Design a protein around this ligand. Structure first.
Ligand SMILES: Nc1nc2c(ncn2[C@@H]2O[C@H](COP(=O)(O)OP(=O)(O)OP(=O)(O)O)[C@@H](O)[C@H]2O)c(=O)[nH]1
Lengths: 232, 488, 82, 75, 69, 80, 49, 94, 72, 82
């Protein structure tokens, strides 16, 4: 009743908030609108299942677009899926194999490195993420990096001595989070409609699982891409 | 219909000001700034442009709900299917915006959100060639990398005014979570770098050269802007200039009513930190963490800001964005920064000379214009042309010369053989060609009939005399800063 | 800041007329304006109080002397007011 | 460049032949040499002389003239 | 505080209209915030010069016209 | 002529206003903007001098009237 | 330094703060500056060797 | 604001502003020459920085002169406000 | 070094002659005191209408704005 | 020390006024600005030997106002003190 001080009372309920008339739409249970600290609590609790990857760059040559491209050229990115092929000069004398031209490139710049593309999407391209996360028991500190070489009136928002509130350490974290916790209001979805498992296999397989599990991952991705690809 | 898209319609999104007024304004030079915003890859320059446009127009169709809220950035100036799907600005999709300065004045600007990626620098080069001021934009995080330096060098070598935008403060306040003094230090380091690169004019927040932006949250300010907004009530009319001069450049308020230049005993931080950066921190910290009622009260009191009852129930990012918008009223400070920076119009001569040749008897009234680049801005062939003298009217015949035939022509002078009509004229505005009959001096417009008369980067002219023709000169081929050496 | 002086500086560039305390009207392109209406013009016709017109290239004026300034119909539209 | 304050500091040290015209006034001029200077345009003038205009040398001595009604100075 | 931009007219001859239909020709030497014209004296309105170097007060200025382009 | 019993000048803005001038003229028109120094911006300003017989009349349109050279203000008519 | 972080952490943090404060707000010697830079770089890993 | 009013009353008593301030204190009739020619005989009530002065017991003296007929005219007023700029020389009548 | 305001401070308790702009007249009386505004006060001020004493006005207080010049 | 205090305290009084030229003005003190601008409702004008020119509303410029003849029932010393 200290860290988990707000949710603890209601976290285990049939409908999480039957009443709580401020925090949800009502008993129809259509929409919700939490305050910050309870959201923080939820986030902390969700550490095992939470998306837990803020650097949007990370899914590089691993987006749905990338998967589609891999499909469309049979240039399967080995961490991800491999499909049935979409279909059924350039001589060794001529070209100079200086760069061994990899499949990863063949989906990155699909129209260039992969000649004779068909039905090929264009993937993203991106900026470098320096979202520095804090460990515990402090705030606003350069840790992971190095420092630079070199008429009676007060400034704005005077009499606000504390720069950081006790929740803003967590609020910042929340702000950097992805779509589930990102926000402090939403419409409900069916338990069914929440994908606790999609976020694991969409992001990359952690470290040195048995071959069978890797295969499983690939299979899952193959399903996912198919679902994405034939919009119903 | 089509995939690679624009507006293609009668009902272009209506503007707050009226486009008749804008066009009227565009009758005279000394009141048409060609900005051509520039920077590295993912500077935020396109996002900045989007912010400006949104600020200008009433309701856009493309401004969906999410973008309005501020989850996704309304990248209004990446119209190409590709430029969306790829996540990069790729071609010049500028806009003509009747922009209000901080001081009461109305100037129509020709922005050009050029590409940042360094393979596309070719395209960017055109913007430099086009634009008379350049809003260089920089990420705080990456700072001034080599690309920025290169850009600066090009601009100085291309003889163009420079007015910098240190962008994405949201990152150093939330991503890096820097303390405010640290942030200040970082800023100093950056600006130091800028100064080192720019051997001539020295840039700073004072003199309104630098602009402190965050296009995701959607706010830019000059110190002049911010000061004007929130340090006009307190301090008197005349002493405001002094205050502005003080804020930035290591001067500490000293807990007292007239600061010292050196160290202070009681407080630690500078004036810039204490009187700007610290406020931003307070805003951000409170616009996430602070119990909303309290925040509302503070806004009511100090900033004189009323939160919408919807905004109280926003999510913490979009709420924050909304608050920021409320605080820093428009992208007006930015415009002030531009105008003030490009108060030299004697640089025009330098520019023109650089482009074509050192010459005179140009203001005889002979209409002539640098055909900058062929674009496909509404799908169809258009030619982005910057006019210098005279004015072009719709359904007029014109002499055009590809800058392949420029040096040769010059040599030959010391018989206007190629020629073409002007089928239609219009104005780039992110996603629409807004048709206009007039095409006045010192501005950028799009024309139909030119395109096929040349390959790339032409000149045009229409002399009323052979003597006049003798007096003419012709632009050089645009030296596109990157040389193409990727052979496919 | 003075909202009429705001309008004046926004009116720069247009063919504006100007009569002083002396009663001698002027008409031409405006160039410069400030808080104190330190006006400059180009291509200015300078009609004396009798009606004697004298065309000239430029002029500079002091604000204390100015009586009223004829602005065009464009500033009726936008964007200073709302 | 020379602001009026600096040009009058030349007139202060020199004390050279000044001729003054007067504000809201065409009928009379002055002829003397600048001796003083205020933060306002008030200047005391020794060897000053009242000189009616060429449409004679009339009597006048040393004068502190209120400088808000000045037109010309030339030392 | 707003400095009248006479740096376009610096070191150029100017026809200064002043109180009582009086004219002043003369090349410009400098100025201040009150518009007080520091100028090299020339012929005053047929025509005749008074003084060598002059300083005209701002309050007495009616206008100042570009003699030189 | 009719007008509301107004408190101050800004409350009756955009009203057709007879505005006297020190040189003898009167400028009549609907006022758009006022100032601390009484500079006025008449929307449909009309130049009316009183020559030494009958009124002289001339139309101006949108014009700035400087405040120093004003004598006084009078309401001539309503808006619209 | 890593040991300092391990037990007497408040002082270590303080040490860092003072160091930085010295680093950037000082007429500091160039060799000293470079040494400091090296220190911060190693801090980024916190003594691998 | 208070320190300026303190040095105001201080600078009045020592400077030449003490004269007509002392005339108000003694409350005598005072003549005043005017910009449009009116010798104002009146009792001074009020007194400020700008020399704007409310006048009791007013008696203005002038000459509406037109038509070769000198008609030295004068009128009595109960109370009147004086603007500063109109004044030329105030004087206390012995 | 001989400025107007220090000479005016020396001119305190001394005879002075005041000239003005429009509807104006010379004077001659002993200056009593002055300020930064240059408001004057004279004792035994004689109203010299173009150098002709029309009346001995005596104890008087002259306004600052209408002052043209002050002499011996 | 400010007579502007007193003139602000003069409200809803019917008063005569003189101007720089010398024009009379009979009307209710609607309000007075801190720079003497006499806002007046229900006004009546007469020029300086000339006939009547009555009007509905007049706000007159402060500097143009010469001398305001005050009404009869008026305690000056009552308003002068704070
Ligand atoms: N954290 C943060 N991210 C931003 C900000 N502004 C922009 N970004 C992100 O970085 C990108 C930069 O803005 P864009 O306009 O998309 O990129 P761009 O300026 O078009 O870059 P070019 O295509 O090279 O011109 C955006 O897509 C955002 O995701 C900001 O203020 N803060």
């Amino acid at each position: 009743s200290q860290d988990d001080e707000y949710v603890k009372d209601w976290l285990y309920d049939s409908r999480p908030l039957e009443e709580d008339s401020k925090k949800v739409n009502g008993t129809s249970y259509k929409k919700w609108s939490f305050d910050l600290p309870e959201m923080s609590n939820l986030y902390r609790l969700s550490t095992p299942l939470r998306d837990e990857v803020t650097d949007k760059n990370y899914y590089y040559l691993f987006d749905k677009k990338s998967f589609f491209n891999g499909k469309a050229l049979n240039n399967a990115i080995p961490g991800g899926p491999k499909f049935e092929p979409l279909y059924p000069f350039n001589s060794i004398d001529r070209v100079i194999f200086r760069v061994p031209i990899r499949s990863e490139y063949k989906v990155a710049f699909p129209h260039l490195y992969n000649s004779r593309p068909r039905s090929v999407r264009i993937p993203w391209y991106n900026n470098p993420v320096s979202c520095i996360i804090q460990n515990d028991e402090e705030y606003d500190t350069p840790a992971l990096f190095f420092d630079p070489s070199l008429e009676d009136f007060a400034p704005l928002l005077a009499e606000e001595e504390e720069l950081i509130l006790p929740n803003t350490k967590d609020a910042m974290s929340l702000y950097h989070s992805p779509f589930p916790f990102n926000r402090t209001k939403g419409k409900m979805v069916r338990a069914q409609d929440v994908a606790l498992a999609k976020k694991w296999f969409l992001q990359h397989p952690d470290e040195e699982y048995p071959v069978k599990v890797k295969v499983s991952y690939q299979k899952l991705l193959k399903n996912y891409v198919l679902n994405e690809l034939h919009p119903t | 219909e089509h995939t690679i898209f624009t507006q293609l319609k009668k009902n272009i999104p209506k503007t707050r000001y009226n486009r008749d007024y804008m066009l009227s304004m565009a009758n005279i030079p000394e009141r048409i700034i060609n900005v051509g915003v520039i920077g590295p890859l993912h500077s935020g320059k396109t996002s900045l442009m989007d912010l400006l446009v949104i600020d200008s127009h009433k309701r856009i169709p493309d401004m969906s709900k999410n973008v309005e809220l501020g989850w996704k950035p309304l990248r209004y100036l990446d119209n190409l299917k590709q430029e969306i799907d790829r996540g990069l600005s790729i071609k010049l999709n500028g806009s003509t915006l009747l922009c209000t300065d901080l001081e009461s004045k109305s100037r129509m600007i020709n922005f050009l959100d050029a590409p940042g990626h360094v393979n596309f620098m070719d395209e960017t080069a055109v913007a430099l060639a086009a634009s008379d001021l350049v809003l260089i934009v920089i990420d705080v995080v990456e700072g001034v990398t080599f690309v920025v330096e290169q850009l600066i060098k090009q601009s100085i070598k291309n003889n163009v005014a420079m007015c910098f935008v240190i962008n994405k403060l949201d990152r150093l306040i939330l991503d890096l979570k820097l303390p405010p003094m640290d942030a200040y230090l970082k800023l100093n380091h950056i600006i130091a770098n800028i100064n080192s690169f720019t051997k001539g004019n020295v840039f700073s927040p004072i003199d309104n050269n630098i602009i402190f932006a965050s296009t995701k949250l959607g706010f830019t300010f000059t110190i002049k802007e911010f000061v004007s907004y929130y340090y006009a009530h307190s301090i008197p009319s005349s002493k405001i200039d002094d205050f502005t001069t003080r804020l930035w450049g290591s001067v500490y308020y000293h807990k007292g009513n007239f600061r010292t230049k050196p160290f202070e005993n009681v407080e630690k931080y500078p004036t810039f930190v204490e009187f700007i950066l610290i406020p931003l921190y307070k805003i951000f910290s409170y616009a996430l963490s602070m119990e909303k009622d309290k925040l509302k009260n503070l806004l009511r009191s100090n900033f004189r800001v009323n939160l919408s009852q919807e905004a109280l129930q926003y999510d913490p990012q979009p709420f924050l964005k909304h608050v920021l918008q409320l605080i820093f009223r428009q992208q007006t400070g930015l415009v002030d920064a531009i105008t003030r920076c490009y108060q030299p119009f004697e640089l025009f001569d330098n520019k023109t000379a650089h482009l074509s040749i050192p010459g005179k008897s140009t203001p005889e009234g002979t209409l002539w214009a640098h055909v900058l680049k062929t674009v496909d801005y509404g799908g169809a062939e258009w030619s982005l042309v910057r006019i210098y003298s005279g004015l072009l009217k719709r359904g007029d015949t014109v002499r055009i010369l590809d800058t392949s035939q420029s040096e040769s022509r010059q040599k030959r002078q010391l018989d206007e053989t190629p020629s073409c009509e002007v089928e239609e004229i219009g104005l780039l505005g992110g996603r629409y060609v807004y048709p206009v009959h007039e095409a006045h001096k010192g501005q950028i417009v799009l024309i139909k009939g030119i395109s096929s008369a040349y390959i790339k980067s032409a000149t045009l002219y229409s002399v009323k005399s052979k003597e006049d023709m003798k007096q003419l000169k012709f632009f050089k081929p645009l030296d596109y800063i990157t040389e193409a050496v990727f052979k496919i | 800041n003075g909202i009429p002086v705001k309008l004046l500086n926004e009116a720069q560039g247009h063919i504006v007329s100007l009569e002083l305390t002396t009663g001698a009207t002027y008409r031409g392109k405006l160039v410069e304006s400030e808080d104190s209406m330190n006006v400059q013009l180009r291509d200015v016709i300078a009609t004396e109080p009798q009606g004697a017109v004298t065309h000239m290239d430029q002029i500079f004026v002091r604000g204390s002397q100015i009586k009223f300034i004829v602005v065009p119909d464009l500033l009726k539209n936008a964007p200073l007011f709302k | 460049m020379v602001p009026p304050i600096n040009c009058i500091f030349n007139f202060l040290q020199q004390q050279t032949p000044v001729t003054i015209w007067l504000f809201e006034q065409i009928g009379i001029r002055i002829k003397g040499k600048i001796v003083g200077f205020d933060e306002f345009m008030n200047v005391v003038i020794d060897e000053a002389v009242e000189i009616p205009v060429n449409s004679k040398g009339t009597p006048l001595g040393k004068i502190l003239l209120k400088g808000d009604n000045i037109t010309l100075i030339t030392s | 505080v707003s400095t009248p931009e006479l740096k376009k007219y610096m070191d150029k001859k100017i026809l200064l209209n002043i109180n009582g239909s009086r004219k002043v020709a003369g090349i410009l030497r400098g100025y201040d915030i009150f518009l007080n014209v520091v100028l090299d004296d020339a012929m005053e309105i047929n025509n005749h010069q008074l003084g060598l170097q002059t300083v005209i007060r701002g309050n007495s200025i009616i206008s100042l016209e570009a003699l030189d382009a | 002529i009719q007008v509301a019993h107004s408190s101050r000048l800004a409350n009756l803005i955009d009203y057709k206003l007879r505005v006297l001038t020190q040189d003898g003229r009167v400028y009549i028109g609907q006022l758009m903007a006022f100032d601390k120094h009484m500079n006025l911006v008449l929307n449909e300003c009309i130049e009316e001098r009183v020559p030494k017989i009958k009124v002289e009349k001339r139309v101006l349109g949108l014009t700035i009237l400087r405040g120093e050279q004003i004598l006084s203000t009078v309401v001539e008519d309503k808006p619209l | 330094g890593w040991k300092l972080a391990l037990v007497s952490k408040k002082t270590h943090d303080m040490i860092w703060e003072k160091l930085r404060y010295i680093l950037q707000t000082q007429e500091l010697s160039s060799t000293l500056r470079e040494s400091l830079e090296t220190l911060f770089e190693i801090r980024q890993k916190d003594y691998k060797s | 604001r208070a320190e300026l009013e303190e040095l105001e009353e201080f600078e009045f008593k020592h400077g030449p502003m003490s004269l007509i301030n002392d005339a108000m204190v003694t409350r005598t009739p005072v003549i005043i020459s005017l910009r449009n020619n009116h010798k104002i005989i009146a009792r001074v009530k009020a007194f400020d920085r700008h020399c704007n002065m409310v006048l009791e017991n007013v008696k203005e003296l002038w000459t509406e002169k037109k038509g070769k007929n000198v008609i030295n005219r004068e009128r009595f007023i109960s109370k009147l406000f004086l603007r500063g700029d109109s004044v030329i020389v105030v004087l206390k009548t012995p | 070094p001989v400025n107007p305001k220090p000479f005016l401070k020396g001119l305190v308790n001394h005879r002075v002659g005041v000239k003005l702009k429009f509807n104006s007249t010379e004077y001659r009386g002993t200056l009593v005191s002055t300020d930064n505004y240059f408001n004057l006060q004279l004792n035994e001020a004689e109203e010299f209408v173009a150098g002709v004493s029309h009346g001995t006005l005596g104890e008087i207080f002259i306004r600052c704005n209408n002052v043209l010049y002050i002499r011996e | 020390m400010k007579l502007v205090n007193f003139l602000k305290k003069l409200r809803n009084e019917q008063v005569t006024i003189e101007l720089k030229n010398g024009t009379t003005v009979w009307g209710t003190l609607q309000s007075v600005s801190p720079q003497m601008n006499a806002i007046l409702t229900d006004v009546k004008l007469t020029l300086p030997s000339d006939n009547i020119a009555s009007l509905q509303y007049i706000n007159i410029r402060g500097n143009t106002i010469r001398q305001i003849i005050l009404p009869d029932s008026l305690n000056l010393d009552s308003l002068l003190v704070d």
